[PDB]
């Protein structure tokens, strides 16, 4: 697909339809020392089999594409619903 860089949509803080910056969604860094991460080593310490099952088989060819819009007039950022696509082209 093709999507323009700027889309006039509603801004919750601006309480009307405003211009926005549109870009793909990117996951953040794993951010070690998380509670869900801390227990991993505390569960991996000692002797035993691979404590947590890990996925090895993959079925879906692609992954869901998500749109991220930022509200220029108030620096707000909104999170949109995902969708399955080949590759979301950001060219206007």
């Amino acid at each position: 697909m093709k999507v323009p860089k700027v889309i006039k949509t509603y801004c919750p803080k601006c309480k009307t339809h405003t211009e926005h910056s549109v870009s793909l969604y990117k996951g953040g860094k794993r951010r070690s020392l998380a509670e869900g991460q801390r227990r991993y080593e505390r569960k991996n310490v000692g002797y035993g089999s691979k404590r947590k099952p890990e996925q090895k088989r993959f079925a879906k060819t692609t992954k869901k594409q998500t749109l991220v819009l930022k509200c220029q007039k108030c620096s707000y950022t909104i999170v949109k619903e995902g969708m399955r696509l080949k590759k979301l082209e950001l060219v206007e």
């Binding site: 000692g46 002797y47 035993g48 089999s49």
Partner: protein, 169 residues
């Protein structure tokens, strides 16, 4: 208070260590268990109540460093309990020191212990060892408790200071 100054030289670091290294070598020639007529660092022994009155004695012993001397299993086991590296003898070497030391002189009893030197291949400790059958200590008001049986062979059940330490009180 010499005992205050004995470790003033040897508190954490002193060139005294070079001298002991010489003593360290000769002790390896000495038997793994032996008797020394006068205990080394009285600051500990007297701190454990040792009295130079007739009826006490000092013993030195050495042990090998490393993890636990545990065999690999052979039957059908789950991976959890079958690894080997990383094990360690749960009860401390300070504790183990008296044990073999205790067996040496069963007609006596153990009170307290400490190391005095240590290299990368051996640990060297010193242990108070008391005769209770001596007709001297038999009449002490200050240690009349020992006349009872229950004080015997204690180190094997871990009622010594090390045992209490191993139990983490």
């Amino acid at each position: 208070s010499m005992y205050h100054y004995i470790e003033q030289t040897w508190q954490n670091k002193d060139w005294r260590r070079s001298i002991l290294r010489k003593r360290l070598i000769e002790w390896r020639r000495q038997p793994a268990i032996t008797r020394i007529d006068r205990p080394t660092r009285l600051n500990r022994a007297r701190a454990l109540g040792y009295k130079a009155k007739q009826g006490f004695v000092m013993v030195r012993v050495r042990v090998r460093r490393g993890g636990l001397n545990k065999p690999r299993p052979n039957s059908g086991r789950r991976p959890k309990r079958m690894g080997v590296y990383g094990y360690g003898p749960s009860k401390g070497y300070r504790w183990i020191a008296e044990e073999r030391a205790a067996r040496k002189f069963p007609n006596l009893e153990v009170l307290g212990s400490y190391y005095v030197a240590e290299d990368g291949m051996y640990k060297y400790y010193e242990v108070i060892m008391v005769d209770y059958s001596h007709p001297v200590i038999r009449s002490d008001p200050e240690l009349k408790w020992l006349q009872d049986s229950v004080n015997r062979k204690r180190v094997f059940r871990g009622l010594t200071s090390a045992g209490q330490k191993s139990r983490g009180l």
